[PDB]
């Protein structure tokens, strides 16, 4: 009474699939499945070298089934839900299926680092992930592209896709290696592409001081949207890699147009508007250097004629020849409070320009 892998596989292979498909399994089938592997990985010569390849082939055949069931929907929404159902089941089988092969994994040589699970998590990456990866993102982004426009959706669809890019990376050195190059990369491109044809239009439609209330409000809405769809669990600077994309796409890409209005806001004393510009050009590298320069030159030329009317009139009354500059300085020492809250960079130019009136 003997037995080989050829005689016993046809009794095992059902139990593999029942576990791969997350189908219910009986207690006796668990023990039969250990007891078959105990028998093949011993009495069979190339037995362990056959459960190894048979199990590659059968895992791969299931993951090809799952890909067809996901790609069965044409609704870019029910297709996201279908991918996560099959994966969440899958990921949850990676903790179960590698157990009846405890002797295989020894005969071929605990916890996560097993050969079977590594075979399961890989084959999902070799196959269904690698093939659907670009569709997975060209669908999830449309649900946020739509979220930016009114369409309320199930925000767990793009979250579930996110935390599925986190769990499939088996790299211990870079855990976010297939999230930082796939999910994060598409969310930056779509956010970028979105504000190249939606934000240049708010500048054609409405004015500039209107666009500043817009770029502002869109850095606030793209941030609380990133603190949902992006990674916050383990620190990665992804949400902040988005705001750099956004600043560049909202504020940096229109700095000259914003800084052109600087000079007149000073003259007309528009402090609520200079504070808004400040809020925007302060997220830009060296963005307020022209701003500083517009308050440094205006202070000068103002205190360059609002002082010439003295040598032709008040020259012997320093009690008046010094007070105009007690008020002049006050015109600018109070613009900075109301507008820049006495930021130390604008005091340096408030002073760099007032030394020239001396």
């Amino acid at each position: 009474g003997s037995l080989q892998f050829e005689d016993k596989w046809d009794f095992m292979r059902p139990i593999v699939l029942k576990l791969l498909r997350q189908e219910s399994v009986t207690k006796q089938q668990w023990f039969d499945l250990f007891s078959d592997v105990h028998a093949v990985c011993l009495w069979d010569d190339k037995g362990p070298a056959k459960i190894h390849q048979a199990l590659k082939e059968d895992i791969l055949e299931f993951i090809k089934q799952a890909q067809a069931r996901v790609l069965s929907h044409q609704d870019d929404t029910a297709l996201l839900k279908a991918y996560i159902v099959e994966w969440r089941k899958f990921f949850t089988q990676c903790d179960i299926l590698p157990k009846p092969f405890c002797q295989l994994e020894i005969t071929l040589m605990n916890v996560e680092d097993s050969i079977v699970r590594k075979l399961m998590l890989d084959t999902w990456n070799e196959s269904i992930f690698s093939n659907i990866k670009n569709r997975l993102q060209d669908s999830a982004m449309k649900l946020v592209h739509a979220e930016r426009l009114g369409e309320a959706f199930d925000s767990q669809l793009v979250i579930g896709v996110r935390e599925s890019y986190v769990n499939l990376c088996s790299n211990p050195e870079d855990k976010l290696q297939i999230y930082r190059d796939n999910f994060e990369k598409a969310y930056l491109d779509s956010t970028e592409r979105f504000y190249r044809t939606q934000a240049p239009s708010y500048l054609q439609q409405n004015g500039v001081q209107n666009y500043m209330k817009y770029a502002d409000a869109k850095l606030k809405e793209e941030e609380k949207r990133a603190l949902r769809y992006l990674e916050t669990r383990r620190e990665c600077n992804s949400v902040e890699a988005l705001m750099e994309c956004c600043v560049n796409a909202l504020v940096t890409s229109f700095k000259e147009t914003i800084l052109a209005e600087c000079q007149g806001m000073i003259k007309r004393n528009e402090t609520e508007k200079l504070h808004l510009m400040f809020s925007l050009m302060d997220k830009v590298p060296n963005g307020i250097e022209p701003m500083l320069k517009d308050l440094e030159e205006h202070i000068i030329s103002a205190g360059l004629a609002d002082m010439v009317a003295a040598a032709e009139t008040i020259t012997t009354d320093s009690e008046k020849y010094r007070e105009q500059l007690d008020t002049l300085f006050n015109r600018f020492s109070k613009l900075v409070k109301e507008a820049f809250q006495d930021d130390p960079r604008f005091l340096t130019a408030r002073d760099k320009a007032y030394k020239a009136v001396v």
Binding site: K27, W30, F31, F34, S35, H38, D95, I96, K99, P100, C102, Q103
Partner: peptide, 15 residues
């Protein structure tokens, strides 16, 4: 033999 217990051990912690 004792593999019945390693199977019985795996059935419990998994289910």
């Amino acid at each position: 033999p004792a593999w019945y217990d390693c199977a019985d051990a795996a059935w419990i912690c998994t289910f």
